[PDB]
Design a protein around this nucleic acid. Structure first.
Lengths: 309, 197
RNA sequence: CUGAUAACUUCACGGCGGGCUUGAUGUCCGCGUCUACCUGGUGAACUGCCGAGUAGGUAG
């Protein structure tokens, strides 16, 4: 249990988001911000980033790609734990299939969870996916405030079973891969503000990249992947989802759920995996503390990270 | 040939700008009787923070002062020891003649400011020419703004909420018999008066 | 209640002359640093007029 070496590599890996501004003359230009340098009499930046006057809409773009790196550890000291883990993932996909996790990630891509506080004060936003490998025209999700609200409402779309099935083949098939390109249109009001990411300094300086000479804000690479992994709704007496860490950390209200006293963190669950291959070789599985722990373990191997001593 | 006094703020538990601003609010409460525009506000301390522990209003000829200092505001306030209106002392002539102007460029640096400015700029395209696309008036992408202090007041009959700004130039003592516009600063620009320390 | 008490060592003074360390010299062969990662503006500096004016003056 917990050798010197154990490490997994991540399955989902997204990229930076890029913001552009569309004009009524039918073009698009990058979005720029400004600092103001606060001087004394005879230093800290303050950055502001607002939508320019007379525009039409904001277009955001990024690209996410799902892979199969969860089926075998990147490192392992002992040929005793790897056998357990590969048949753990094999019994999980035999008994209780990949559709819950796949739908629960694709919902967070399709509604704009990665538009962190940018859809407050917004009229309509429209998300378009371009998947790969694929044959057909693009997969559109239109006006997510008043047309897409729940899991039953997404399933009444034309192109949903194919998207969740290619995510299932990516998580299942060894040497398998799916790639989605995402771009989303935001119709913000006149002179609405924009909230990108902020650099770590110990005020309010933005994260930026250069797009063809103009600097632009991005809203993160690691931030935008912490919004596709807000799926943790299985902790004891649950009410509200979480980023899938190992110690159930809710960010703003400082405290951590899933403390190791409760035994519902990753290590207390992981060290009882011979019980999970015990129960999943039977003929009935309870959905209250056995399915809700296999979901947490499989969502926490997809994240990756080194499980050492 | 006239004089200053210090309304001192001493409760030793107070924020200074938010008392000084409503002192200037009740200064604007005065001078609706008719436009007797003869008052300077004259904040005698000015650090790189903290608008001073004092305020020092000026009058002209010793009696208009106590029409201003009975401004329906300290009469129900000064039962106890919180402020101190200083008692009408002819000026010691060892001070410095400094300025107080509302500069209207702290207020028009914001993105709302050039939004208003560009929407005015073809509000009055009525000298009819070829209309521009507004896709090129990109803002000042790096700006070094100097020191300023802000006072939080509001509009005189409407619910419009601006602020007002103060700087501390030093300039040219002798000029005229010192009228201004309404509430107390020296951005009149017909007679831009220094009112001393 | 001190092997007790007391106890001005000092003046002068030229170490100099001379001196070729050199000859020769292959350090090289091999080499995977890798896995994981939300810094946040609670709401928050408005609405106008003149200026041919991203510059400049105003009223509240």
């Amino acid at each position: 249990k917990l050798p010197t070496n154990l490490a997994y590599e991540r399955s989902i890996d997204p990229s930076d988001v890029c913001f552009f501004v569309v004009w009524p003359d039918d073009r698009k230009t990058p979005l720029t911000y400004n600092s103001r340098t606060l001087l004394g009499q005879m230093p800290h930046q303050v950055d502001f980033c607002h939508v320019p006057y007379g525009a039409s809409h904001i277009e955001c773009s990024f690209s996410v790609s799902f892979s199969s790196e969860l089926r075998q550890p990147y490192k392992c000291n002992s040929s005793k734990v790897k056998q357990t883990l590969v048949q753990l993932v094999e019994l999980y996909e035999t008994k209780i299939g990949w559709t819950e996790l796949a739908t629960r990630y694709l919902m967070n891509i399709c509604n704009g969870k990665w538009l962190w506080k940018n859809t407050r004060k917004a009229y309509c936003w429209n998300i378009v996916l371009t998947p790969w490998p694929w044959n057909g025209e693009k997969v559109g999700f239109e006006d997510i405030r008043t047309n897409y609200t729940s899991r039953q409402d997404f399933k009444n779309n034309k192109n949903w079973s194919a998207i969740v099935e290619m995510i299932k083949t990516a998580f299942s098939s060894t040497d398998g891969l799916a790639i989605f390109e995402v771009r989303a249109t935001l119709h913000l009001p006149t002179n609405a503000m924009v909230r990108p990411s902020q650099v770590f300094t110990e005020s309010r300086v933005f994260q930026s990249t250069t797009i063809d000479g103009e600097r632009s804000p991005i809203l993160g690479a690691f931030k935008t992947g912490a919004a596709i992994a807000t799926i943790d709704d299985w902790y004891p007496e649950a009410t509200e989802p979480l980023r899938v860490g190992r110690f159930g950390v809710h960010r703003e209200d400082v405290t951590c759920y899933r403390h190791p006293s409760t035994g519902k963190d990753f290590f207390s669950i992981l060290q009882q995996a011979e019980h999970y291959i015990e129960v999943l070789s039977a003929n009935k599985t309870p959905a209250q503390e056995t399915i809700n722990d296999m979901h947490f373990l499989m969502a926490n191997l997809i994240k990756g990270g080194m499980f050492q001593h | 040939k006239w004089y200053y006094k210090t309304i001192t703020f001493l409760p030793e538990l107070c924020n200074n700008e938010s008392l000084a601003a409503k002192c200037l609010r009740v200064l604007h409460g005065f001078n609706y009787q008719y436009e007797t525009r003869n008052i300077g506000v004259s904040f005698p301390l000015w650090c790189d923070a903290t608008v001073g522990k004092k305020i020092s209003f000026v009058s002209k000829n010793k009696i208009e002062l106590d029409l201003l200092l009975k401004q329906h505001y300290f009469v129900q306030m000064e039962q106890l020891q919180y402020f101190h209106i200083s008692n009408t002392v002819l000026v010691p002539e060892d001070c410095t003649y400094v300025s107080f102007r509302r500069c209207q460029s702290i207020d028009k640096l914001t993105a709302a400011g050039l939004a208003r400015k560009i929407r005015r700029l073809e509000k009055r395209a009525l000298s009819r020419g070829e209309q521009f696309d507004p896709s090129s008036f990109a803002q000042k992408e790096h700006t070094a703004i100097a020191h300023y202090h802000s006072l939080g007041e509001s509009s005189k009959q409407t619910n419009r909420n601006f602020r007002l700004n103060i700087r501390m130039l030093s300039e040219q003592p002798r000029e005229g018999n010192s009228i201004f516009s309404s509430y107390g600063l020296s951005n009149s620009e017909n007679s831009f008066q220094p009112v001393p320390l």
